[PDB]
């Protein structure tokens, strides 16, 4: 029993910056990489970047300037931060576990709706 | 970047058929490629990593294969449960991408 919950804002207004968190229970943030996936109402899954057990992050080429991944060991929770929201960043966002080139525990997500 | 296509995007079948979904990458990925399967209003599973290996608790009618930018899941006769999306993902280098999605359905 491992668990990933995600709780975000809501509605936001285009502009505005946005700040989702992935609260882990069961394993250890200094064991495993998160990563962070989004996906458009009806579309597919798109990457958006990691955190690995050492905190070194990776991100998605083109969202890269507008994000921002962070943790705290300590709360046990992993953080996603974008800039300047377009209507288009409206998705369902989650966290998902990676070990060993899996992401074997993903959480249930949290919508985001950029309506102004 | 290397880029995951998906085909088909969409396939009917009825319980009990075969199927076998496509998962093609823009540039070799070395086997490390995964695929999940996600239903309505749910997250993502993990069925199938690196190529072949079955994740915990994954029926046997559940088998992929595939090396360098060709890649495959097959399901052998296909059971109520096993209709929704499927995406492939690869783990080479970064940034990681997904596959478009496979979206299985009911005929």
């Known amino acids: 029993q491992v668990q990933l919950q995600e709780s975000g804002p809501g509605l936001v207004a285009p502009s505005q910056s946005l700040s989702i968190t992935c609260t882990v229970s069961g394993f250890s943030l200094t064991g495993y990489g998160v990563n962070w996936v989004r996906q458009p109402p009806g579309k597919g899954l798109e990457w958006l970047g990691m955190?690995?057990?050492?905190?070194?992050?990776d991100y998605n080429s083109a969202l890269k300037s507008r994000l921002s991944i962070s943790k705290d060991n300590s709360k046990s929770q992993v953080f996603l931060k974008m800039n300047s929201l377009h209507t288009d960043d409206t998705a369902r966002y989650y966290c998902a576990r990676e070990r060993d080139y899996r992401l074997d525990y993903w959480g249930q997500g949290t919508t985001v709706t950029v309506s102004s | 970047d290397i880029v995951l296509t998906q085909s088909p995007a969409s396939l009917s079948a009825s319980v009990g058929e075969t199927v076998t979904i496509t998962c093609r990458a823009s540039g070799n990925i070395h086997n490390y490629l995964a695929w999940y399967q996600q239903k309505q209003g749910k997250s993502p599973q993990l069925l199938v990593y690196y190529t072949t290996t079955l994740a915990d608790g994954v029926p046997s009618r559940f088998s992929g294969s595939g090396s360098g930018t060709q890649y495959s899941l097959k399901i052998n006769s296909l059971q109520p449960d096993d209709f929704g999306s499927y995406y492939c993902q690869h783990f080479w280098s970064t940034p990681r991408t997904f596959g478009g999605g496979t979206k299985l359905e009911i005929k």
């Open positions: 955190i690995w057990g050492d905190g070194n992050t």
